[PDB]
Structure formats: C-alpha cells, structure tokens
A paper describes a structure:
Mupirocin, a clinically used natural antibiotic, inhibits isoleucyl-tRNA synthetase (IleRS), an enzyme that links isoleucine to its tRNAIle for protein synthesis. Two IleRSs, mupirocin-sensitive IleRS1 and resistant IleRS2, coexist in bacteria. Specifically, type 1 proteins (IleRS1) are strongly inhibited by mupirocin (Ki in low nanomolar range), while IleRS2, which are homologous to IleRSs from the eukaryote cytosol, exhibit resistance to mupirocin concentrations that are about three orders of magnitude higher. The amino acid is first activated by ATP to form an aminoacyl-adenylate (AA-AMP) intermediate, followed by the transfer of the aminoacyl moiety to the tRNA.
The displacement (shift) of the HIGH motif in IleRS2 is of utmost importance for the accommodation of the non-canonical A/GXHH motif and emergence of hyper-resistance. Hence, to explore it further, we extensively analyzed the residues in the immediate vicinity of the HXGH motif using mutagenesis combined with biochemical and structural characterization (exemplified for the W130Q-PmIleRS2 mutant in Supplementary Fig. 8 and Supplementary Table 2).
Numbering used by the authors: 1 to 1032
Write the structure that this text describes.
C-alpha cells in the first residue's frame, strides 16, 4: 500500500493528484457511485466571462466545493454542472474598450455581427482562464459540459420562460420614468441601481417664478436638480397646505406658511393666507423660455408636497421625475423632453445644447442670477445613483421600456423568501427582504446588441403582440422560411418577421435585448433545456437544496433566480442560501486591478498549494462578513496545517516501510494511554466537525481539525517517536503503528472537503482508494474518553507553565532540575498517572502535588505611604525599614492576624493598620512560580554540582550520538570512543559513566589528554574532541 513520500513542492503534489483524478474519472465516479442515494441539489452561479479571477473569486468556489464534497461523503448525490455568464453590459463594455470604440453609433459603424463575434471570442478566452483557475483550485464542477448563456438551447429555454410570462399578462411595454445610464444609453433595473449608490454633493436652488396678470409677485419654487428647470411645465403645491403671500421690500413672494421664516430672511410682512387649493390655476413665467409648453406653466395640486423642507412649491419636469410625469399627465399638461439619449441638451435648449445636463449645473445657477430669478442656493450631500458598470451618474429619464410585472406577485415573492434558510440569518429580512418589500417592476429591456433578444414581435398595423416560446413557434408564425439553424441573437432574429394573427400585417421584433440578470436567473430551467429536453432530470434537480455566492447577489443572482422562478412557476428555486462576504486586501480596501491590490490566486496556488489557500479562506475568518486577506495567512496555513500533515504522513510511511508494518496483518497490540488519548481526540474532533458542517459552520469545523492536528504533531507523534525508532515489533510499537494508521486514514477523510489534494494523497497511498469516493467517518463513541482528554489538557497546561518558568530563568530543558511542585485546589486530575510524562517534559527529578503553597512561599512586608504617611510623620521611613526587617514568621503572622506592631530604634513601639502594610508573597529561596489561577507551578531553580554535571553528561551523550550519525555507522555497532576535554567534562563523564553506557552502545570509553585527527564538537560552552576507532 504505502509507497513513499518524496521531496516535492506543493504544486508538484497537487499536479500529480490532479492527474490521478483525471486517469480515474474520480469526480465522475463520486457522482455516479451515489446513484439511488438521496439527492442534494446544487446550482452553480455562473461567473461572468469578462475578466481574470482574483482571490475573492476563490471564496465561493471553495465553499461550494466543501459543501458538495461533504454532501457526497454523507450519502447524497450532488450533480454539479458548471455555467458561464456571457451576455450583457459586463461583456460589451470590455469589448468596446478592446476595440477602442464607445457608444451605440460606433458599434453600428463597426458592424453588429462583427462586434458580437468579438464578444464571443472574448468570452471564450475568459471562460478558459476561469476554467483553469477552477481546476487548479480543486473545485469539482463539470466544465466539460457546462451551460452557457449564449448557447441556442439556453436562449430557447429563456424564450420559453419569457413567453409563458407574456401569456400571463406580466410582460408589458410602457413609457415610464426609469433610471437611465447616459453613457451606456440604456435603462437599468432596480437591483442594478441598488448596486451603484455613491455619496455626492450638489446644489439645490430656490427660484422666483413671476405670477402672471400680477406685478412684483413671485412664487418661490424649489428644486434639487437645477438642470431640469428649462423643462419646467408646472409648479406643485399641496391643496390642504397653508401658503402665504409675504411682502419683502419691493416684491411679494408666495411660499408655504410653515417655511416662510426659513425662506424669507432679513425682513418680511405676511399680507394674506391662502390654501393650496386656492393657488391652483394661477399662471407664471418659467425661468427659461427656450422650450415652448403649449399646456403648462400653471400651478397644480399634488399630495406628495411637504412643508417639512423647501418652499412648498415644487418645480415639475415631467420627463425627469416619476411624480412630475404622473402629475403633469393627470392635469392634461404636455410632456416635454430636452435631453437626448446621451444625457446631453437637445436643440430646444440653445445655450447648453450638446452638454451633459449635470455638468451644466453651475452655469445654470449663474444664468438664473442673470435673469434675476434666483433666491437661494444650498449644498446637498446625499446618495445618488451611478451605473454599476460604466460608473457614470445615472439620470431619471422618460423612456419606453419592457417590464416584467414582479409587483403583481410580490406577496408570493415574500412567501417564497419566507421558506428560505439564509446564512447569515439577517439577510433574510435585512438586505434581501427589505429589497423585496420595496419592489418595483423589473425593467428588462436594454437598447444594446450582445445579449438575449427580447422575443416579442409587434404588428406594425394593430400592435398585437406575439412572443414565440421556441424556434418551432418562431418558424410557425414567420411569414418567410426560417432555417432550423437560426441563431437566437441579433441581428439574425431581427431579420425574422411574423404574420399578425389579427390583421395579417407585418410583425417586427422589438429591438432590445434583456437584462443579463434574467439570463442567469433562468438557469434552473435553461441549464437542462427545459421543457424541450431532460424533463425528468430537471424535476429531480429543482429546487436547489443550496446555493452559495457573494453578498452582492442579494441585488443580483439571488433576486433574479427568485423573480424568474416565482414568475414562471410560482415556486422558490432554492431552499437555502449562503451569502458570502467579499474578500478585501489586508487593509480592508476592496481589491481592484486599477488599485493593484488584487492578489493573483493562481500565483498563490502555485506557491503554497490550493489546499493552503482554501484552508486560509475557510479558517482565518468566517465567510459571512467582509474578509481581510493576505498572502501571509496562506503562508501560515501551509506551514502550520498542510506541512504538518505531510510531515506526519511521511514519518509514518518511512518508518512503516522500514519496520515492515502491514495494516492487513493482525498484530498483538499494547495500546498506551497516549494512543487512547489521541484516538479520543480524533473521534471527538470527528463529532464536533460533523456537527459544525451540518450547520454550514466551515470555520469552526476547520479550527477544530487544526487543533487536533496540532495535538497530533506536537504531542502524540513527538512523544511517541521512540516507538517508531525502536527495533523489533513488540506490542507497543504495533499499537503505535495501528493508532497512527487509523488517525491518518480518518483525518484525511475528515479533511477531504477542505483540502482535497493532500487528503487524497494520504488516503490513497494508505488505502489504495480515493478519499473522495469514501464515506465521511462516523464518531466511535466507544473510543471517546472525556476524563482522559480533560486530564491530558490539564497536563499540557502544567507543562506550559513549567516551560514558561524555565524560559524566564534561562534554564534550558536539557539542564535537569530538582523538583516541580504543583499547587492544586481540587483533586480533579489523577496526577499520579502522568508523573512520568511531566518529569520527562520539564526534566525534573521530582513532581509533587500540594494543596497549598505554605511550604513554597514566604511573606515580605512594606509600608503603604499613600495610606499611612500622616500617621507616622517623620517616622515613616524608619517604620518602613523596620517592616522590611521583620522575619519570615513575622510576615506570616501579619498575614494571619492582620494586626502588627514595629519597635523602632529609639525603643518606641507603633501599631500598624491592615491598610498601612503592603504584603508581598515571594517564592522561597531557589524557587520560581508561574500560575494560571487553576494551577501553580513552583520550579526549584537551584543548581548543584551534581545537576550541572548530569547536564554535561547528557550533552556529551548527545554529541556522541550526533557524531555517530554523521559518520554513517551501523546502529548495532559497538564503538571505541576517545574523548578529550577539560577537567569539568572529565569529572562529569566519570561520575555518570553508567548513564553514558546505558545511552551509548560503547565497547570502550577512553578519556585522553590529546586526540590526533579528532572531531571538535561543542558540549555546552566547552569544546570536546571525539574519535571513533572500531566498527566505524
Ligand atoms: C453568481 C454569478 C452572477 C450571475 C454573475 N455572473 C457574477 O457576479 N459573476 S462574477 O464572476 O462577477 N462573481 C462570481 C462570484 O464571486 C463573487 N465575488 C465577486 N467579487 C467578490 C469579492 N471581491 N470577494 C468575494 N467574492 C466575490 C460573486 O458574488 C459571485 O459569487
Ligand atoms: Zn453605464
Ligand atoms: Zn395586426
């Protein structure tokens, strides 16, 4: 079974394991071997094929992989089909940059087909880069037969979904004020808008509107967007709000009563009161008269007008605000637009014609000053929407768009969300639920070229709508031949016309493509070409038991999945969501190619291994909140966890080969208490890690396993090395091999979801079988020993205290010390059974357990000046010296009694209060103390000549052993040793001759004054010459 561990880099090991997986079809087999087992349904969120993966993209892939691998080992069939997101602005803008073009006109000049072909080439390149990263990460997901949103079958399924929605009356065209990108030149959905808010500072202005058929009378109108003033059509007031005409100097101003003292400043006199109902119908003069409004420039009532802020009179521009649009339409007032598709001023506004409307703000203000209509200006700091792709400021623009009527099913939305288990829980009614509660209809139409065509044909004659669900329906309705090979993209589908079933007129397809989020949201149905194929497989693969993606999908794939599934089937498409916090750099800053702070995950995988990167991503911090990350954490994962497992595994393999241990052979076993302890810790770790994984606590399970690995290396193997080093297969050595074999097999199984490469290396070399075809190990409670674990933990605490004392007092563990005393308050731990271990680890001749420190401490008394200065006056220092002069028993007496007296030099006796004396408990001479509260270790640090000489003899023994290894001698060869050194070394060697002979297989030992051709070694601070003569 066991072959060998070799000097190989992490990359070489992982490449070898990957090749093993390829030759054996291990991923395929881990799916197929679970046929007939219960299903665990997993949906892969399709990464966008528009860029190179960064380290953040390794998080979800890792977590998904863990889940899938874990669910496979606990007896589920987990089908994993990969997907790529290939449409939309996320691809189009990058391709435009590659081509050095921008805007729809440039694309039309370039050619729609040529631009689309460029998009296809780009997405293919990025797909391959993503695929290589995914394979090197060890995330098993089928990328040889993935779903791709640009494939015809996927688009046909999307078309079927959209047509079914249209059948329900929930897909409609409407002229609405929608968020709009002036650069991308398209409307955007509400989730896209939610992804792009930034804090900005701009100007809100109060402007005078001359009342008509009056003189020196002006309405005070308010706006937060000065650039819409040329498009003014009306002024809005609340009908039940009280307004005032107030004289100020030569003029009269109309303003809300509650706001007049704020708007009017310096001097004013209120002449009359009017309700907003009365101000209705009064005409006025617009600040800009470039635009001609045939019906407008009046005052109207609107219930949303507030007296909390502004003036109570609100400028209304119907094309650039939803409320303005609704109110202007209700009163019959006319709709005017002064902005082109790029956000620039149209010809109807001459002075700024051809400039972005927002950038014209400042000039507008001065223009207002030159017409003498400005009244106030104020800075406004607020959240404003920016495009989630181009980063341009958005505009609210009247535009004809296609909507999915999500609001019609809002209740069902909420119901479906109520059935979903969210990790972390707060997303359910927080980030996600709050977005559901504020639902607006889904604007899906994009005036772009690369994407899923909106499959709605409209009759030029009577505007009847037909939405083909399939290529067959498209062919059926077409007025001309349509080949079976038709590609469902622009411009090919724009050359397909239909005959209107109503009037036989020409039906043309609406030109738009759909929002990319619809493509990804349709994957449960489109990944298997439902309902045209794989109906049984689709039924078995719906809904998902889990999905796991980043938190941004709360305004993304989580929403688009929920929306498409609710509109199409009414059902929730997933039962459970893992919403992952984004990975940041070590400073907490978001990683970007522009910033240059993005770590290359491929380089990290090459340097430290995918196992290390995954472990760092899982164990350094939880996946729910934003995660600081660094190369250092990957380094620490590799050195502390992965390397440790590899070293233990190689140790086992080497010595099992040398001693000819065969796990199939039945040996007589003499299991020690350390074997039992490590087995108990193993099965306890199995239990706790399983419990955490069942609740998707990856971090806690990883940390538990890491604790077990540290205990296995630093304590079990290190203290059991002699049993592997010894010669002859006694019961104790066989028990050691059996214990380590069980630990390695079960541990590699536990680690299989976390660190798949090294886990398979260990498991396959030890068992001949891949760990990823294995069952997750069960906890054997009969091997759990809670008492032994508790006692061993106490022993470890004592050992750490002893080491701390030795380090504080520069007493190297190679130097034996006389005693350790452990003061313990309770008989919790059977210390006797561990005496040897403790005496071994701290190198002490005696280990004594005491219930009190009476025999180990003394008391030293001093005076508290801050509490007793005035009482003793000039005698304070004399009293303090007398206190420092009392005997040990006097200090013990003060500690017991609390009352003390000091007899000063003059013979005067003085009484000391408890608060006057500062008490110090010191260790007895030669002793040093460390304490964790529960345990107090007192170490005898006093050195004798005998102790020092024993230390020198130990150093000589070690030097001789090292020299024997250096000269490559047989382990059974008895040697003639010649030793030269000063008299301290000679006396130490002579006194401990017996010990040297027990620890060295010496035929003769000669102490010589001078050694010819001898090796000079360092024994402590001394130099000693050694020489071997026979059997060298
Ligand atoms: C589910 C996929 C969506 C439909 C879409 N194609 C998309 O967002 N595609 S992506 O490639 O941009 N994102 C892939 C996954 O990585 C997450 N992610 C993106 N940026 C980070 C980051 N900085 N830190 C951690 N995770 C991050 C996404 O949420 C998605 O899960
Ligand atoms: Zn944009
Ligand atoms: Zn018609």
């Amino acid at each position: 079974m066991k072959e060998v561990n070799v000097r190989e880099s992490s990359q070489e090991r992982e490449q070898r394991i990957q090749q093993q997986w390829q030759k054996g079809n291990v991923f395929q087999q881990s799916v197929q071997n679970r046929e007939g087992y219960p299903s665990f349904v997993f949906y892969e969120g399709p990464p966008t094929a528009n860029g190179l993966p960064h380290v953040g993209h390794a998080l979800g892939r890792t977590i998904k992989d863990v889940v899938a691998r874990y669910k496979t080992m606990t007896g589920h069939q987990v089908i994993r089909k990969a997907g790529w997101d290939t449409h939309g602005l996320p691809v189009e803008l990058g391709v435009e940059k590659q081509l050095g073009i921008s805007g729809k006109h440039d694309i039309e000049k370039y050619g729609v087909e040529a631009f689309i072909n460029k998009c296809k080439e780009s997405v293919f390149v990025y797909e391959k880069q993503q695929r290589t990263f995914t394979e090197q990460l060890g995330y098993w997901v089928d990328m040889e037969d993935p779903y791709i949103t640009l494939e015809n079958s996927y688009i046909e399924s999307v078309w079927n979904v959209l047509g079914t929605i249209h059948d329900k009356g929930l897909l409609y065209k409407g002229h609405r004020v929608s968020p709009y990108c002036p650069s991308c030149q398209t409307s955007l959905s509400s989730h896209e808008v939610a992804q792009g808010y930034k804090d900005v500072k701009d100007l809100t202005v109060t402007v005078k509107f001359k009342v008509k058929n009056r003189d020196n009378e002006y309405f005070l109108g308010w706006t937060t967007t000065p650039w819409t003033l040329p498009s003014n059509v009306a002024l809005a007031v609340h009908e039940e709000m009280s307004y005032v005409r107030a004289e100020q100097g030569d003029s009269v101003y109309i303003v809300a009563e509650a706001l007049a003292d704020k708007v009017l400043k310096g001097e004013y006199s209120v002449l009359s009161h009017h309700k907003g109902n009365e101000l209705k119908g009064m005409s006025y003069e617009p600040p800009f008269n470039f635009v001609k409004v045939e019906k407008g420039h009046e005052v109207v009532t609107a219930d949303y007008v507030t007296d909390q802020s502004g003036t109570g009179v609100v400028h209304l521009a119907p094309a650039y605000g939803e409320d303005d649009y609704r109110v202007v339409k209700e009163n019959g007032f006319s709709f005017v637009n002064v902005v082109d598709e790029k956000g620039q001023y149209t010809s109807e506004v001459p002075p700024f014609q051809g400039r972005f409307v927002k950038d014209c703000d400042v000039d507008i203000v001065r223009y207002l000053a030159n017409q003498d209509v400005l009244y106030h200006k104020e800075k406004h700091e607020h959240s404003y929407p920016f495009c989630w792709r181009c980063d341009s400021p958005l505009l609210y623009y009247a535009n004809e768009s296609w909507f999915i009527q999500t609001t019609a099913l809002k209740e069902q939305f909420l119901k479906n969300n109520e059935s979903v288990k969210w990790y972390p829980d707060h997303i359910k009614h927080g980030r996600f639920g709050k977005f559901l509660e504020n639902m607006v209809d889904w604007n899906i139409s994009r005036k772009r070229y690369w994407g899923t065509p909106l499959n709605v044909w409209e009759c030029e004659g009577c505007q009847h709508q037909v939405a083909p669900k399939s290529i067959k329906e498209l062919q059926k309705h077409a007025s001309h031949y349509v080949d079976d090979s038709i590609e469902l993209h622009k411009p090919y589908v724009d050359d397909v016309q239909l005959t209107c079933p109503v009037c036989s007129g020409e039906m043309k397809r609406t030109p738009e493509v759909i929002d990319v989020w619809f493509d990804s949201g349709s994957m449960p149905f489109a990944q298997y070409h439902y309902p045209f194929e794989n109906s049984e497989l689709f039924q078995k693969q719906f809904p998902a038991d889990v999905i796991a993606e980043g938190i941004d999908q709360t305004r993304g794939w989580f929403y688009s999945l929920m929306a498409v599934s609710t509109l199409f089937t009414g059902k929730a498409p997933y039962k459970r969501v893992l919403s992952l916090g984004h990975v940041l750099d070590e400073n907490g800053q978001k990683m970007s190619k522009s910033k240059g702070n993005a770590l290359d995950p491929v380089d990290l995988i090459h340097t430290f291994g995918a196992d290390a990167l995954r472990w760092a991503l899982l164990a350094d911090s939880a996946p729910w909140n934003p995660k600081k990350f660094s190369e250092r954490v990957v380094q620490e994962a590799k050195s502390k966890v992965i390397d440790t497992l590899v070293n233990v595994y190689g140790f086992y393999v080497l010595y099992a080969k040398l001693d000819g241990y065969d796990p199939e052979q039945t040996y007589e076993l003499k299991k020690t208490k350390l074997d039992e302890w490590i087995l108990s810790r193993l099965h306890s770790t199995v239990k706790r890690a399983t419990v955490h994984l069942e609740d998707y606590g990856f971090t806690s399970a990883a940390r538990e396993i890491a604790v077990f690995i540290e205990e296995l290396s630093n304590w079990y193997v290190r203290r059991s090395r002699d049993r592997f080093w010894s010669e002859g297969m006694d019961g104790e050595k066989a028990a050691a091999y059996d214990t380590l074999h069980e630990v390695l097999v079960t541990l590699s199984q536990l680690l299989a979801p976390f660190t798949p490469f090294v886990a398979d290396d260990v498991h396959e070399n030890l068992t001949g079988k891949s760990v990823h075809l294995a069952d997750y190990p069960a906890c054997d409670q009969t091997k759990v020993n809670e008492k032994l674990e508790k006692e061993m933990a106490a022993v470890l605490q004592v050992v750490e205290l002893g080491r701390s004392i030795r380090n504080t007092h520069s007493l190297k563990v190679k130097q034996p010390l006389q005693s350790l005393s452990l003061v313990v308050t309770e008989e919790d731990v059977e210390w006797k059974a561990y005496r040897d271990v403790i005496k071994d680890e701290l190198n002490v001749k005696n280990f004594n357990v005491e219930q009190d420190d009476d025999k180990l401490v003394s008391y030293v008394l001093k005076l508290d000046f801050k509490q007793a200065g005035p009482k003793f006056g000039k005698q304070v220092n004399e009293v303090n010296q007398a206190l420092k002069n009392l005997s040990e028993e006097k200090g013990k007496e003060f500690v017991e009694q609390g009352k003390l007296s000091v007899t000063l030099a003059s013979g005067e006796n003085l009484t000391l209060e408890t608060e006057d004396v500062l008490v110090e408990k010191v260790p007895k001479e030669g002793f040093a103390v460390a304490s964790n509260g529960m345990y107090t270790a007192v170490l005898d640090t006093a050195l004798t000549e005998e102790l020092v000489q024993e230390g020198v003899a130990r150093e000589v023994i070690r030097a001789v052993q090292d020299y024997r290894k250096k000269l490559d001698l047989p382990v059974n060869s008895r040697i003639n040793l010649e030793l030269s050194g000063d008299e301290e070394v000679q006396k130490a060697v002579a006194k401990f001759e017996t010990l040297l002979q027990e620890n060295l297989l010496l035929h003769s030992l000669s102490v010589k004054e001078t050694i010819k051709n001898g090796e000079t070694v360092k024994v402590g601070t001394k130099q000693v010459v050694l020489r071997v003569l026979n059997q060298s």
